[PDB]
Write a protein that binds this ligand. Sequence first.
Ligand SMILES: OC[C@H]1O[C@H](O[C@H]2[C@H](O)[C@@H](O)[C@@H](O)O[C@@H]2CO)[C@H](O)[C@@H](O)[C@@H]1O
Ligand code: NA
Length: 568
Amino acid sequence: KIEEGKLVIWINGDKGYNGLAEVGKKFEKDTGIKVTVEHPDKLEEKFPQVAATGDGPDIIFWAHDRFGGYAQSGLLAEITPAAAFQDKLYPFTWDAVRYNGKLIAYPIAVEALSLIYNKDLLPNPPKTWEEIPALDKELKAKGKSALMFNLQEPYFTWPLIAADGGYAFKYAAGKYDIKDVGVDNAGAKAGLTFLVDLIKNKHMNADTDYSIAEAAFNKGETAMTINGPWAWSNIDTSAVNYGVTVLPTFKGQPSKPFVGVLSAGINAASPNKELAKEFLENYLLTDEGLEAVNKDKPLGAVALKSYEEELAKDPRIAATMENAQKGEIMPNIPQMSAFWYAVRTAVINAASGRQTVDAALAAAQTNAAADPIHYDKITEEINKAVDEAVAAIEKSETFDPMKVPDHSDKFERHIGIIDLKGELDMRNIQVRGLKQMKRVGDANVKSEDGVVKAHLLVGVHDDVVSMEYDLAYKLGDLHPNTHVISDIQDFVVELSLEVSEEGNMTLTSFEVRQFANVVNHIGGLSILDPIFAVLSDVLTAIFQDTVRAEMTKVLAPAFKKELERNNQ
Ligand SMILES: OC[C@H]1O[C@H](O[C@H]2[C@H](O)[C@@H](O)[C@@H](O)O[C@@H]2CO)[C@H](O)[C@@H](O)[C@@H]1O
Ligand code: NA
């Protein structure tokens, strides 16, 4: 229950919430009304969840791109600033928060990504993304790195993906055609493929996230990084001598980062809409107000004419403005969340190798047009389901060691002056190592007609699934009996789940992907023994058919009974 007479405010953890708190103290020193600032995790989703239950904070902070959907849901109260107040803020920043002709929030400051380099390590930073692989070679020779930026959020990679032609929604005659997406076009594949080549060529790691990139850069390890104004504070207090400049160009074209406007919205179910207006219009959106917040963490180009004008003489801000001009201001429509999840998923999978650049973006083209949902929420949820299910399997002993029915097969190959005939049969077949199969990566979710579909991967990586067994084959007059051990590398399972509106999780599909490779160790026989090649080829073949199948038929049931136990 939103407490009346008090002000609860939410802002992102990477912003100057400590400074925002001080402004909250002054408000309390003048009105007696306490202001509490909190920076929850996943607030861009937490808010719409609690605010939908008629609860939440009185004021929520975030880039305008999210607010479109918030307002659509009726979670945001229409702001009421006098024409005189609007006048003291740049018009374009009001357009940013205008949804359906109504102003649904107060703009705070414009923010754009810029290139951040180490003056000492790199006095003159590269002007293009292409001359970066070369620069990495040099730095590596000195135990350094060329570039490190968050690859877990599509917000940071998008600048490159759009550079050559990528785009979210086609804007036409004052309207964003939610059907005309542009993430898998020629211009987009070029960018993502480039980004992927950087990882394939080990110039950067896919696992790299915000904190890892920040630590390396501020530690002096990497020469460059890509971040926003908020990031400057931590670099200031580091030892790194830094500069902020124009992002690298791609194919003679500038990187087009999505520009966002940090906005403050008032929760519709708030009983303190007047106290909220006071705070925002007369305590935060003042030169003294924005300064307190800015000292803690730079806001970028504030929407307040007076202050934006004062800090406009900052080289770093001058850079940010340059990047903003080259890129475009994000649309605020509700479909924006889908767009983000789609791209976020395409980038992550393409960078991890889970999907090829084409497969990823094609799926993003589709997903960006699906029914927006609390992705994170549902993802963590489904992962949790599979995990516990897989952990249950780990308990049973029926699958590890997994007994496998014998098998016999006849073959032949015209080897010389003989249509070489001969067969062999396997006994005491046992699969091992399936007790260590975890979930690889997040569940890739999508919602259609109210039903959620999820695709996952369960496998035994950084380990091996061996199948030991007694073998016997016929070679002319030789009837040898030995023991074999076939190792399978990269054992993977493709899962397909479906969560009904009733909340029922039913297994859609289950298949053991064909083994990337199989290394047969035939006892007493050497890889140099001419026969090995034939036997190995046969064993591996019946492995990719018989074994792999009678392995799926045994794991499919166990995965159904679990993913559908508590089901109902
Ligand atoms: O990565 C997708 C994400 O991008 C934007 O979020 C930014 C935000 O604008 C910045 O102020 C800062 O907090 O970094 C965020 C990236 O993690 C969009 O505003 C957001 O909706 C979107 O999910
Ligand atoms: Na802080």
